[PDB]
């Protein structure tokens, strides 16, 4: 390996030997969730209304 | 052995998981896959008397 490995500096590395990942994510705002689905069978039945009565 | 009993093997698993893709309401975008097939996969295909007549 490289001479520098023991004298190396980092950034975003803490801990005295600098292991610890303190690294910060990157986000644009992609969201994830379940498919669309749409009714196809409406209209194909006799309609009653009983609303109120 | 025969050729031909085997391209209709792999056609038939495609259209096991076609169908299957078919039931998570994605059948709407059957235009947006695709299908990547090896050398050998590609000419077993040809063989097949359903997918090349008229």
């Given amino acids: 390996d490289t001479p520098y490995k023991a004298d190396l500096s980092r950034v975003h590395w803490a801990g005295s030997n600098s292991d610890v990942d303190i690294h910060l994510e990157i986000f644009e705002g992609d969201v994830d969730s379940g498919f669309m689905y749409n009714s196809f069978f409406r209209g194909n039945s006799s309609y009653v209304s009983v609303q109120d009565q | ?54």
Avoid at chain 2, 16 to 27: A, F, N, P, S, Y
Avoid at chain 2, 32 to 45: C, K, M, W
């Fill in chain 2, 1 to 54: 052995a025969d050729r031909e009993l085997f391209a209709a093997n792999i056609i038939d698993a495609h259209r096991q998981g076609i169908e299957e893709m078919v039931r998570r309401d994605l059948g709407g975008s059957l235009t947006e896959f695709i299908t990547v097939v090896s050398p050998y996969v590609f000419g077993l295909l040809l063989d097949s008397k359903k997918l090349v007549n008229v």
